[PDB]
Ligand binder design. Structure first.
Ligand SMILES: *[B]([O])([O])[C]([C][C]([C])[C])[N]C(=O)[C]([C]C1=[C][C]=[C][C]=[C]1)[N]C(=O)C1=[C]N=[C][C]=N1
Ligand SMILES: [Mg+2]
Lengths: 233, 231, 235, 211, 250, 222, 240, 244
C-alpha cells in the first residue's frame, strides 16, 4: 500500500474505421503543483501499439521499462520478431493486466490507469483499459480520470455504438479527440495545454505527434462577467 | 567405461556416455513417424503391446489445441516433458493471450533436458519426442533428443527400425510437402512411411495410432476403428 | 559406487531392472477381467504354521469401485495404497464423483520414478489394480516400479507368472462369466503354488458394479475350491 | 437459521430450516443445512454457509479414508473431534460455524455440538442458530427418552416451526432426518407456509394468528 | 553447486585409529619448534621466525598472537590454519563470553572454546582437521598464570613447561632438567632462549626469534588513564632489542 | 489506504428448463456513476456444454472464469477427455472459491447447463464457495428486484386456482424456452427501469443437448 | 543434508542393508511370544555373560507402549529405544485425536511403517530390530500377538519367537502349540513359554524374563522366584 | 561427484555389525582404564591418566572425571575432545529438566538422553560416531545410588561394578571375584585401587597417574556430596590402602 506522488491526469482514446487514436497531456503534477512540463505519457510498443498511462509517474516509468524489456525478450530466438511473431496489442495488454492484478493481490499496486491502443495482425482495432485494481473493460471510446467524465460523452456522440465505427473517418476522430483535450484544459485543474497524440492505422501505420497545443480557445466572454451577482462595475 | 558412472563426467574423447545410454533407450522404443505439408502436420505411431491380453501402450500426447507430440523410449519421461509443455503452452495463453510458437516450445524442451546433463545426482531423460503444431508461421515438425538437441524438419522418424521410414520420407520430400488442403492424403503418406519400418507384424486396428493438426484442424488423436480407414 | 538414477549401456535404469527381480521372488497374484466383473486372487504363502494366515493382507480395497492385489516386497506397497486411497477420496472431494481406474493407476505410477539422491530407491512391488467406472467399464491394470502401466484382460505377477500367463493365454475369452473366472484363478493358483491350495493359504476377491469391491470369505472360497475339484474330476 | 437434534430411545432426530439471508434480503429458501457425511453420519450447518459446507465435506473425506485404513466406520466422537481440531487451527481468523455431528456407532446414538469458537460438547439435545432460542422451549417441554419415532419426528418438526414463525432469519421449509443403527433416513421437505396452517388447525396452536 | 560433502572425512580405521588426526599430528611434527614455560610470576612463549625469503619482511608475519589482553598464543605446523584459528579465537572470546559477562574469559575456558572448534573440524562434514598444535599462555584473577597445549584432535592439557614441533622431544628433556616451582619470569625467559637455541640452525637473534610474555600489568600499554581498576594488558611481545640484551647475558 | 476491491455493477439470471437452461446477464460495466462499457460480455461458454458468469468485482470475476476454463482444460488432460458434468464443475468451483477464504473473490457466480439425465441445471455460488442447485436464480445488483418476480411467474408462488379460494395451488406446469426468454427479457426491462447499474444490453446464452446458442437484446441506455 | 542412498537393490533383486539388519536381529537375545485363550505371555532371554549387573535399573527387555499394549524385541538395543519412543508418542497422539486407545494391529502397523520408511529414505540405515507386539484391544477379550521386522512387513501369530536360536524354539512351538486348544489358563501359557526358552537359554536362573498381559490393561512381570518354580516343575516332570 | 569420497559411516556389515561402532570400541580399548563401584552407602569412581609427564600441571588438569551436576558424575574412556562435546550437552539437559520440573534429573533419564544422541550418529547423518565410553555415577530419590555405562553404539546398561577402557576383561574378572552386595564405600575405594594396580600397563601405580572421585551420603544428614579428589588426597588414600 502506498500513495501516488507525481501524477499524470486523463488519457483519452477512441476507435475509427481503419484504426484507433489515443492522446494524453505532457504534465507530471505534484499535488496542486504543476511540477514537470515535459513528461511523455504515451509509450509506443513496436509499430502497432501505443500504451497510454495515467496515475503515478514512478510506476509509469517502471511499466515503461517492463515494456522495453518485453520487446527485447520477444526478439530472443525469434526469426519472425519483425513479422508473424511480433508483439500484438492483445499480448501487451494481457501481460500488463496480469501484472496489475497480481500487484493488487499482494496489496502493493501499480497506482495507474492504462489504455492499450493498437491494431492487430488481421487489421482489427484493439482498445482496452486496465487499472490498479486489475479491472479491465473495452469500449469504442475509453478515457481515464477526468476524461471518463468529460471526454467520453463527447467521443460517444461520434461513436455511440459498434456500428458507428466504420462510419467514422480519421479526420473526424482526430477532430473529436483534439476538441476533448481542449475541454479538459478548460475544466481539469491538473491538466496542461501541451499534449501528445498517436494514431495507429491499419494502412498508414503508426503516426506519433508530439508538442501539440490546445488552440482556438474561447475566453473573450470573460470581460463581460463582473462580480458574483449584484456588482455592476 | 570409467567415465559412464554419472552424467557429470566427460570421457577422454569428449563424450557423455550417460546421455548416449539414454539415447539408446529411444532406439529400443517402438517406431513413430512425423511429417508435414504447408497446411497440416501429421504424427503416425506404431503402438506396442506386452502380450495378447494386454493393451497397446499409447504413444501420442496432446499438449494444446494447436500442439502435441509422439514418444519413443521411457513413457514416464514423456509424461513429465509433455506436462511441462502443457504448462508452458498454458502460461503463454494465460499471461500473453498468445499461442506458444512451436519453435519456442522446442527451445524450452532443449533447455529443460540440458540441465539434467550438466548436474550431479540427476539423470538425462530417456525418451525421444516428435512435436507437431500449427502456429502463426504455419505447420511445424520438431524432433527432440534428450541430449538437448532439437531440430525442425519437414519429416522424420525415431525408434526401432526408424531408418527405413526416414529414407522413404527423404525420397518423397517433394511430393508430400505439396499435399495442401488434403488431410487424408497426408496421413496416407505417413502410414506408407511407417510401413517401411515394419517386419513380421503389420498395421492392425488396435496397433496403429495417428494424430493431425492444421489450419482449421485442432490437434486430434485417432485410435481404434477411426484408423481402420487407413489400414 | 555409482548413481541410483544411472542408465545401463542398453538404455535401462539399473535400479528399476533390479527391483523387477525382487518382484519375481514375490508370491503369485492373478487378475482376470470379464464383462460381469474383475476377479483378483493371491497366494498367501505363510512362512510358518503358527502364523495366523488371515492377517496376511495382499488384497486391498482402494475405493468401493477399485481393488488392488500386490506381489514382491509387500511392505513397500503400504505407502502406494495410502496414496491411492488419498487420491481416490480427494478426487471425490474436488469433483463429487468416482475417479477413473486409469486416472487412479496413473496417480500411483507417478510415484514410481520419484527416486534419486524424494525416496532413495524404486518400489520393490508390483500391483494389479482392478476396478469399474462408467466410461470404460471393468478394467485391470498392471502397475510397475518403472512408472509404466499396461491394461490387461488377464494378468499374473510374482514367482509363477510366466507359467500362469501362458495358461491365461489359452483360457481367457471375451464371454467369460464371473463364476468361470473365479474357478480359473483358483485353477492357475493351484497349478503354480508350492503348497496345496486351500481356503487358508489362498484368497479370492472381486469387483462388480452392483456390490463393489469384496474380499471373499474363507467359507465362500472353500466351496469354489470344492466345485473346482469336482469339475476337473468330471473329465 | 434454526437447526436441532436430539438423542432418544430409537436413535437421533435431526431437523433444520432452509432459509439463507443477506441482510434483510432473503437470498434462498431451499438450503440444505443437513449434510450427508456418510450413510451413518449427519452434520448440521449454521452461520457461514461456505465455512460449514467446505469443512464438513472435508470431514466426510477424512472419515472415508479412516474407514479404508482401519476397516471400520469412524465414531461420532472421533469425527466431531477431527472437525474441532481442523477449525481450531483457524481460530480468530474469522470462521463462522455452528454444527452438530449426529450418528449411530458402537456406543449407540451419538450427538456432538461443534463450533468455530472451539467448543465440542456431547449432549442429548441441541439447537443452534438465530432461532434456536424459540426451538428450545418446545423441545424442553415435550422431550422424553421414551418417544416414538412418529412423535419424535413431529417434535423436531414442530420445534423448527416455532422458530420459523418468530425468527425473521428462519423459515422456508423443514428438512427432517431420522438416524438409526441401520443408517439415516430422510423424512422429506416440508414447506413452512403449508405446514403452519396445517398445524394451526390440527393442533389448535397459534390462536393469535388469523386463518 | 551446494556443499555436497555432508559426510565425515575423518573416520575410524579397523585398528581404532583416526587417520586424519594422526596425519595432522605428523604435519605438526614437521613444523618449526615452539615452546612455553610457566614461572611463579609469569609465563613465556617463544618460537623461531623461519623466514621463507630474505626479501620477505618477517616482522609482518606474527607467529605469536594476542587473543585477549591477558592471553597469548603460539603454534607449530601449518601457518594459515593458525591464522584463521586466531581470528576465530579472538571472536569467540567476545561472542561467547565478554558480551555476556562484561569481562574477558579465563585462560582455561578460552582454550576450551578453541578446542571445541578444532574437535568439530575432526567430526563435521566435508572438512579436514586443523594441521596445528597451539600453545596458549594466559592469566586470570582466580586461576592465576597458566599454560595449555591444544592438539588437532581438540584435546588440551595444562603444562608447567613444554615444547611442540620439530625438536620437541629434545626440548622437553631440556626443560625437565631446568624447570622448578620457584622460577622467576626472567629465569624462565633465560631458559626459553637456551632451549630454543638448540633447535635453531642459522642466525639466532632478536630479528629471527619471536618471544612474548604473560606477566605484570602494563599501564603504559593501556592507552588511557582515569579508571583505577583498569591497569593494562599482561600480554607483552618482547622487542628485537629486548631479546638481544638477554642474549648477551646468555 | 488501498482498497483492493471494487464494484462493476451488473446483474445476471439463470433459469433451468425441462431439457434446456439459460444464463442471462446485462452487458453494462460501471464504476460509481460512470459507464465504462455498454457492451462488455459477462456470460461465457466454458466448454463441455457449461456456461458461467461471475458477477460483482470484474477483476475477480475474470480471474475465476479464467481459472475454471483452465480447470476444464486440465480435467480433459488428466482424465482421458472425459466430459465434466455440471455437478462436478460446481464442486470444483467451490474449491476455487474457498482457496481464497481469507481474501475472497468478490463475486456471485452462476453456472448453467444440463445434468447427466439431460435435464436443465442451474447452480448458484456465494463468494466463498457455498453452492446449491436451483431452478431459478438472479444474482448481482438488481437480484432483489428480479427474484420475487420469478418466484411468482416461474414457481407460481402465492398463486391459487380460482373458485377454490386458497385451498388448491396453481399446478407447477413446465415452461418452454420461448416462455422463459420472455420472462428473462421482462425481468431485465423492469430492472433497467428502477436500477441505474442495469441497462445498455442483454445477452442470453441458451444451453441444450445440441450445444450453446446466443441471443442479444438492446436495453435502455440512460 | 546427508542424502546418500544406503538401502538399494542389488543385481539379484536384494536390498542387502535390510538383509544385514536381519543378521543383527539373529545376533540379538531370544524373544518369544505365546497367546493363550485369555492372555498373552512374552518371554525374553538375558545373556549371562554380563554379571555384576544391577537388575533394578538395567533397561528391561519388555516395554509398555500403553497401559494395554507391550513391545519386546531382538537386535540392536539402541535402535529399539527409537521405535519404542515413537510408538509411545503415537499411542498418546491417537488417544488425543480419536479419543480411543490404539488397537494392537494399529500400533503394529505404525511401527512397521516406520521400519519400512528407513529402508527407502536417503541418508539413513534400516533398524536392526524385529519386534513382538502384544496386548488386548480396548473393550475386547481376544488376545493379540504381532511381529515386525526391518523390511517393514508385519503379521499376526498364534505363537512366535525371534532372535538367536529362534529356529530351535520355533521348532518346539510348532509341535507343542495346538491351535484347536490353546493354553486355557495363565499357568499353562507361562509354562509353555518357559519350556520353549529352556530349549535355548542355558541356566533357568536370572536368564529368563516373563511378562504376562491380560485383558483390561492387566500387565505384570513375574519375579525370579516365581519363574524358578516353573523351571523346577518342568525338569522334575522331564526326569521320567 | 562427492559420492566417490564417502566412507559411509552408518552401514551394516554382512554379519550385521556397525563397522564404525566396532572400530570406535577398538579405539576405546587403548584408553586409560576407568572403574566404577557401587556400594550401599555411596559410589566410587577411579581412573588412570595415560602416560603422563613430570611437567604436566596435575592439580588444574582434568581428562577422566567430570561433573554433570551436583548429584551425577562421569568417568571418560576415549577421545577427550569428543567427551567434552557430550558432557556439555548432558549438563544442559540436566538444567533443562530442572527448569521444567523443578526437580533434579533422575540419573537414568540423563543417561538415556546421551545414549540416544550417540545412537543417532550410528543410524543417520553420515558422520563418524563419538569415540567415547562413559561410566555414569549418580544418585536420585527413586533408585538411590546408580552406576551406568554407555558406548558409541548408544547402548546403555546398569551395574554394581564395572570397568571401561583398557584391560576391562582382566579388570571385570577381579571385580567379579572380590565384590559383595553388603560392601561399603571405604571397602569399594580399596577394591577400585587394587584392581587398577593389578591391571595397569605402568610399572607402578602412583598419585600423579590417577583421578579419583566418590559420591557419598556421607554429607551432613539426608543429602549427597560429590568429592573430586585432589592430588595430595589421592596420595594419602594410596598410602592408607597400602599400595605405596
Ligand atoms: B442461518 O441463518 O445461520 C443461515 C445458515 C446458512 C448455512 C444458510 N445463515 C445465513 O443466512 C447467513 C447470514 C446469517 C443470518 C443469521 C445468522 C447468521 C448468518 N447468510 C449466508 O450464509 C449467505 C450465504 N450466501 C448468500 C447469502 N447469505
Ligand atoms: Mg438503466
Amino acid at each position: 500500500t502506498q500513495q501516488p506522488i507525481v501524477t499524470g491526469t486523463s488519457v483519452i482514446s477512441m476507435k475509427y474505421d481503419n484504426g484507433v487514436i489515443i492522446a494524453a497531456d505532457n504534465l507530471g503534477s505534484y499535488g496542486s503543483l504543476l511540477r514537470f512540463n515535459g513528461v511523455e505519457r504515451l509509450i509506443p510498443v513496436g509499430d502497432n501499439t501505443v500504451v497510454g498511462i495515467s496515475g503515478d509517474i514512478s510506476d509509469m516509468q517502471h511499466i515503461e521499462r517492463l515494456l522495453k524489456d518485453l520487446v527485447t525478450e520477444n526478439a530472443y530466438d525469434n526469426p519472425l520478431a519483425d513479422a508473424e511473431e511480433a508483439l500484438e496489442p492483445s499480448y501487451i495488454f494481457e501481460y500488463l493486466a496480469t501484472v496489475m492484478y497480481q500487484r493488487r493481490s499482494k496489496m502493493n499496486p501499480l497506482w495507474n490507469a492504462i489504455i492499450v491502443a493498437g491494431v492487430q495482425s488481421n487489421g482489427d482495432q484493439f482498445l482496452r483499459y486496465v487499472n490498479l485494481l486489475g479491472v479491465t473493460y473495452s469500449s469504442p471510446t475509453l478515457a481515464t480520470g477526468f476524461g471518463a467524465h468529460m471526454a467520453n460523452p463527447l467521443l460517444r456522440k461520434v461513436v455511440d455504438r459498434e456500428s458507428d465505427i466504420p462510419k467514422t473517418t480519421v479526420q473526424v476522430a482526430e477532430e473529436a479527440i483534439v476538441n476533448a483535450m481542449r475541454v479538459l484544459y478548460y475544466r481539469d485543474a491538473r491538466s496542461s495545454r501541451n499534449f501528445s497524440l498517436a494514431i495507429i492505422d491499419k494502412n498508414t501505420g503508426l503516426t506519433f505527434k508530439k508538442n501539440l497545443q490546445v488552440e482556438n480557445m474561447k475566453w473573450d466572454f470573460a470581460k463581460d462577467i463582473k462580480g458574483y451577482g449584484t456588482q455592476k462595475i | 567405461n570409467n567415465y559412464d558412472g554419472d552424467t557429470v563426467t566427460f570421457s577422454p574423447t569428449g563424450r557423455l556416455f550417460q546421455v548416449e545410454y539414454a539415447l539408446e533407450a529411444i532406439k529400443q522404443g517402438s517406431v513413430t513417424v512425423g511429417l508435414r505439408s504447408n497446411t497440416h502436420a501429421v504424427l503416425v505411431a506404431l503402438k506396442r503391446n506386452a502380450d495378447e491380453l494386454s493393451s497397446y501402450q499409447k504413444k501420442i500426447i496432446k499438449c494444446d489445441e494447436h500442439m502435441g507430440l509422439s514418444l519413443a523410449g521411457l513413457a514416464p519421461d514423456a509424461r513429465v516433458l509433455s506436462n511441462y509443455l502443457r504448462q508452458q503452452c498454458n502460461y503463454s495463453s494465460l499471461v500473453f493471450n498468445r499461442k506458444l510458437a512451436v519453435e519456442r516450445a522446442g527451445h524450452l524442451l532443449c533447455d529443460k533436458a540440458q540441465k539434467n546433463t550438466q548436474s550431479y545426482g540427476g539423470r538425462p531423460y530417456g525418451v525421444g519426442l516428435l512435436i507437431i503444431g500449427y502456429d502463426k508461421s504455419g505447420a511445424h515438425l520438431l524432433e527432440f533428443q534428450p541430449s538437448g538437441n532439437v531440430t525442425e524438419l519437414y519429416g522424420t522418424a525415431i525408434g526401432a527400425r526408424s531408418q527405413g521410414a526416414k529414407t522413404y520420407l527423404e525420397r518423397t520430400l517433394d511430393t508430400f510437402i505439396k499435399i495442401d488442403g488434403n488431410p487424408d492424403e497426408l496421413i496416407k503418406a505417413g502410414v506408407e512411411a511407417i510401413s517401411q519400418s515394419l517386419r513380421d507384424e503389420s498395421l492392425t486396428v488396435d496397433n496403429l495410432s495417428i494424430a493431425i493438426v492444421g489450419k482449421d484442424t485442432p490437434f486430434t488423436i485417432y485410435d481404434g476403428e477411426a484408423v481402420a480407414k487407413y489400414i | 559406487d555409482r548413481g541410483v538414477s544411472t542408465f545401463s549401456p542398453e538404455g535401462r535404469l539399473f535400479q528399476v531392472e533390479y527391483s523387477l527381480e525382487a518382484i519375481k521372488l514375490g508370491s503369485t497374484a492373478i487378475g482376470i477381467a470379464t464383462k460381469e466383473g474383475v476377479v483378483l486372487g493371491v497366494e498367501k504363502r505363510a512362512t510358518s504354521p503358527l502364523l495366523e494366515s488371515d492377517s496376511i493382507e495382499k488384497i486391498v480395497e482402494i475405493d468401493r469401485h477399485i481393488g488392488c492385489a500386490m506381489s514382491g516386497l509387500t511392505a513397500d506397497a503400504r505407502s502406494m495404497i495410502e496414496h491411492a486411497r488419498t487420491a481416490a477420496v480427494t478426487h471425490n472431494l474436488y469433483y463429487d464423483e468416482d475417479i477413473n481406474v486409469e486416472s487412479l493407476t496413473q496417480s500411483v505410477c507417478d510415484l514410481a520414478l520419484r527416486f534419486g539422491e524424494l525416496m532413495s530407491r524404486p518400489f520393490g512391488v508390483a500391483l494389479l489394480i482392478a476396478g469399474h467406472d462408467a466410461d470404460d467399464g471393468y478394467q485391470l491394470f498392471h502397475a510397475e516400479p518403472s512408472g509404466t502401466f499396461y491394461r490387461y484382460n488377464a494378468k499374473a505377477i510374482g514367482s509363477g507368472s510366466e507359467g500362469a500367463q501362458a495358461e491365461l493365454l489359452n483360457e481367457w475369452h471375451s464371454s467369460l462369466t464371473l463364476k468361470e473366472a473365479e474357478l480359473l484363478v483358483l485353477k492357475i493358483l493351484k497349478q503354480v503354488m508350492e503348497e496345496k491350495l486351500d481356503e487358508n493359504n489362498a484368497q479370492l476377491s472381486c469387483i462388480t458394479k452392483q456390490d463393489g469391491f469384496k474380499i471373499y470369505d474363507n467359507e465362500k472360497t472353500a466351496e469354489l475350491i470344492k466345485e473346482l475339484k469336482e469339475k476337473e474330476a468330471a473329465e | 437459521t434454526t437447526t436441532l437434534a436430539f438423542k432418544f430411545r430409537h436413535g437421533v432426530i435431526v431437523a433444520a430450516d432452509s432459509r439463507a439471508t443477506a441482510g434483510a434480503y432473503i437470498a434462498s429458501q431451499t438450503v440444505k443445512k443437513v449434510i450427508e457425511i456418510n450413510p451413518y453420519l449427519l452434520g448440521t450447518m449454521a452461520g457461514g454457509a461456505a465455512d460449514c459446507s467446505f469443512w464438513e465435506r472435508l470431514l466426510a473425506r477424512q472419515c472415508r479414508i479412516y474407514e479404508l485404513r482401519n476397516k471400520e466406520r469412524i465414531s461420532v466422537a472421533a469425527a466431531s473431534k477431527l472437525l474441532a481440531n481442523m477449525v481450531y487451527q483457524y481460530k480468530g481468523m474469522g470462521l463462522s460455524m455452528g454444527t452438530m455431528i449426529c450418528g449411530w456407532d458402537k456406543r449407540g446414538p451419538g450427538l456432538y455440538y461443534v463450533d468455530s469458537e472451539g467448543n465440542r460438547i456431547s449432549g442429548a439435545t441441541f439447537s443452534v442458530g438465530s432461532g434456536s432460542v424459540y426451538a428450545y422451549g418446545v423441545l424442553d417441554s415435550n422431550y422424553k427418552w421414551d418417544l416414538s419415532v412418529e412423535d419424535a419426528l413431529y417434535l423436531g418438526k414442530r420445534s423448527i416451526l416455532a422458530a420459523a414463525h418468530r425468527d425473521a432469519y428462519s423459515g422456508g421449509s423443514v428438512n427432517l432426518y431420522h438416524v438409526t443403527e441401520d443408517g439415516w433416513i430422510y423424512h422429506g421437505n416440508h414447506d413452512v407456509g403449508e405446514l403452519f396452517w396445517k398445524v394451526k388447525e390440527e393442533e389448535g396452536s397459534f390462536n393469535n394468528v388469523i386463518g | 553447486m551446494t556443499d555436497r560433502y555432508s559426510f565425515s572425512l575423518t573416520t575410524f580405521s579397523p585398528s581404532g585409529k583416526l587417520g586424519q588426526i594422526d596425519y595432522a599430528l605428523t604435519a605438526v611434527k614437521q613444523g618449526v619448534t615452539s615452546l612455553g614455560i610457566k614461572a611463579t610470576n609469569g609465563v613465556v612463549i617463544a618460537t623461531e621466525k623461519k623466514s621463507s625469503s630474505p626479501l620477505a619482511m618477517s616482522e609482518t608475519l606474527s607467529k605469536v598472537s594476542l587473543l585477549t589482553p591477558d592471553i597469548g598464543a603460539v603454534y607449530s605446523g601449518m601457518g594459515p590454519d593458525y591464522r584463521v584459528l586466531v581470528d576465530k579465537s579472538r571472536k569467540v572470546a567476545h561472542t561467547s563470553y565478554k558480551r555476556i559477562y562484561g569481562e574477558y574469559p579465563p585462560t582455561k575456558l578460552l582454550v576450551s572454546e578453541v578446542a571445541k572448534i578444532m574437535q568439530e573440524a575432526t567430526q563435521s562434514g566435508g572438512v579436514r582437521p586443523f594441521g596445528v598444535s597451539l600453545l596458549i599462555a594466559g592469566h586470570d584473577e582466580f586461576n592465576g598464570f597458566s599454560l595449555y597445549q591444544v592438539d588437532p584432535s581438540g584435546s588440551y592439557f595444562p603444562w608447567k613447561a613444554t615444547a611442540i614441533g620439530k625438536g620437541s622431544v629434545a626440548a622437553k628433556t631440556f626443560l625437565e632438567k631446568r624447570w622448578n616451582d620457584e622460577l622467576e619470569l626472567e629465569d624462565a625467559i633465560h631458559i626459553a632462549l637456551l632451549t630454543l637455541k638448540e633447535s635453531v640452525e642459522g642466525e639466532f637473534n632478536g630479528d629471527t626469534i619471536e618471544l612474548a610474555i604473560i606477566g605484570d600489568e602494563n599501564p603504559d600499554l593501556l592507552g588511557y588513564t582515569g579508571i583505577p581498576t583498569d591497569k593494562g594488558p599482561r600480554f607483552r611481545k618482547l622487542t628485537s632489542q629486548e631479546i638481544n640484551d638477554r642474549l648477551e647475558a646468555l | 489506504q488501498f482498497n483492493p476491491y471494487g464494484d462493476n455493477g451488473g446483474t445476471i439470471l439463470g433459469i433451468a428448463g425441462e431439457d434446456f437452461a439459460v444464463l442471462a446477464g446485462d452487458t453494462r460495466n460501471i464504476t460509481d456513476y460512470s459507464i465504462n462499457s455498454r457492451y462488455e460480455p459477462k456470460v461465457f461458454d466454458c466448454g463441455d456444454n457449461i456456461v458461467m458468469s461471475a458477477n460483482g468485482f470484474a477483476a475477480d470475476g475474470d480471474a475465476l472464469v479464467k481459472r475454471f476454463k483452465n480447470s476444464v482444460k486440465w480435467y480433459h488432460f488428466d482424465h482421458n477427455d472425459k466430459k465434466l458434468s455440471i455437478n462436478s464443475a460446481a464442486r470444483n468451483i467451490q474449491h476455487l472459491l474457498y482457496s481464497r477464504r481469507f481474501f475472497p473473490y468478490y463475486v456471485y457466480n452462476i453456472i448453467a447447463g444440463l445434468d447427466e439425465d439431460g435435464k436443465g441445471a442451474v447452480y448458484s455460488f456465494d463468494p466463498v464457495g457455498s453452492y446449491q442447485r436451483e431452478q431459478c436464480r438472479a444474482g448481482g445488483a438488481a437480484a432483489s428486484l428480479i427474484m420475487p418476480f420469478l418466484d411468482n411467474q416461474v414457481n407460481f408462488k402465492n398463486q391459487y386456482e380460482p373458485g377454490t379460494n386458497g385451498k388448491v395451488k396453481k399446478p407447477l406446469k413446465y415452461l418452454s424456452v420461448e416462455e422463459v426468454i420472455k420472462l428473462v427479457r421482462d425481468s431485465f426491462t423492469s430492472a433497467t427501469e428502477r436500477h441505474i447499474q442495469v441497462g445498455d444490453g442483454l445477452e442470453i446464452l441458451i444451453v441444450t443437448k445440441d450445444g450453446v446458442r446466443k441471443e442479444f437484446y438492446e436495453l435502455k441506455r440512460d | 543434508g546427508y542424502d546418500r542412498a544406503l538401502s538399494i537393490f542389488s543385481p539379484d533383486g536384494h536390498i542387502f542393508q535390510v538383509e544385514y539388519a536381519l543378521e543383527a536381529v539373529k545376533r540379538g537375545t531370544c524373544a518369544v511370544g505365546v497367546k493363550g485363550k485369555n492372555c498373552v505371555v512374552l518371554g525374553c532371554e538375558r545373556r549371562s555373560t554380563l554379571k555384576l549387573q544391577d537388575t533394578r535399573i538395567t533397561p528391561s527387555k519388555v516395554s509398555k507402549i500403553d497401559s494395554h499394549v507391550v513391545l519386546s524385541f531382538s537386535g540392536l538395543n539402541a535402535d529399539s529405544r527409537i521405535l519404542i519412543e515413537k510408538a509411545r508418542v503415537e499411542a498418546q497422539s491417537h488417544r488425543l485425536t480419536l479419543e480411543d486407545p490404539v488397537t494392537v494391529e494399529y500400533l503394529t502397523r505404525y511401527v512397521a511403517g516406520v521400519q519400512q520408511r528407513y529402508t527407502q529414505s536417503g541418508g539413513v540405515r534400516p533398524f536392526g530390530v524385529s519386534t513382538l507386539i502384544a496386548g488386548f484391544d480396548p473393550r475386547d477379550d481376544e488376545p493379540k500377538l504381532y511381529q515386525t521386522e526391518p523390511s517393514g512387513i508385519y503379521s499376526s501369530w498364534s505363537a512366535q519367537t525371534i532372535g538367536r536360536n529362534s529356529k530351535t524354539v520355533r521348532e518346539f512351538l510348532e509341535k507343542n502349540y495346538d491351535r484347536k486348544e490353546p493354553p486355557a489358563t495363565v499357568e499353562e501359557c507361562v509354562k509353555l513359554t518357559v519350556r520353549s526358552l529352556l530349549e535355548v537359554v542355558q541356566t533357568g536362573a536370572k536368564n529368563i524374563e516373563i511378562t504376562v498381559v491380560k485383558p483390561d490393561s492387566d500387565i505384570v512381570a513375574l519375579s525370579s522366584e516365581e519363574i524358578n518354580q516353573y523351571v523346577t516343575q518342568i525338569e522334575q516332570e522331564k526326569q521320567e | 561427484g562427492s559420492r566417490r569420497y564417502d566412507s559411509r559411516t552408518t552401514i551394516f556389515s554382512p554379519e550385521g555389525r556397525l563397522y564404525q561402532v566396532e572400530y570406535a570400541l577398538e579405539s576405546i580399548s587403548h584408553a586409560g582404564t576407568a572403574i566404577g563401584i557401587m556400594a550401599s552407602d555411596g559410589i566410587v569412581l577411579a581412573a588412570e591418566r595415560k602416560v603422563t609427564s613430570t611437567l604436566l600441571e596435575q592439580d588444574t588438569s582434568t581428562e577422566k572425571l567430570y561433573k554433570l551436576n551436583d548429584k551425577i558424575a562421569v568417568a571418560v574412556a576415549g577421545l577427550t575432545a569428543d567427551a567434552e562435546i557430550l558432557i556439555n550437552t548432558a549438563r544442559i539437559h540436566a538444567q533443562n529438566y530442572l527448569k521444567t520440573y523443578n526437580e533434579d534429573i533422575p540419573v537414568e533419564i540423563l543417561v538415556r538422553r546421551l545414549s540416544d544422541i550417540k545412537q543417532g550418529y550410528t543410524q543417520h547423518g553420515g558422520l563418524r560416531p563419538f569415540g567415547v565410553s562413559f561410566i555414569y555415577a549418580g544418585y536420585d530419590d527413586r533408585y538411590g545410588y546408580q552406576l551406568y555405562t554407555s558406548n558409541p553404539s548408544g547402548n546403555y546398561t546398569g551395574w554394581k561394578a564395572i570397568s571401561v577402557g583398557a584391560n576391562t576383561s582382566a579388570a571385570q574378572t577381579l571385580l567379579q571375584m572380590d565384590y559383595k552386595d553388603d560392601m561399603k564405600v571405604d571397602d569399594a575405594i580399596e577394591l577400585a585401587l587394587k584392581t587398577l594396580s593389578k591391571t595397569t600397563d605402568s610399572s607402578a601405580l602412583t598419585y600423579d597417574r590417577l583421578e579419583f572421585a566418590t559420591i557419598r551420603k556421607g554429607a551432613n544428614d539426608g543429602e549427597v556430596y560429590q568429592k573430586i579428589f585432589k592430588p595430595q588426597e589421592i596420595k594419602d588414600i594410596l598410602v592408607k590402602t597400602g599400595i605405596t
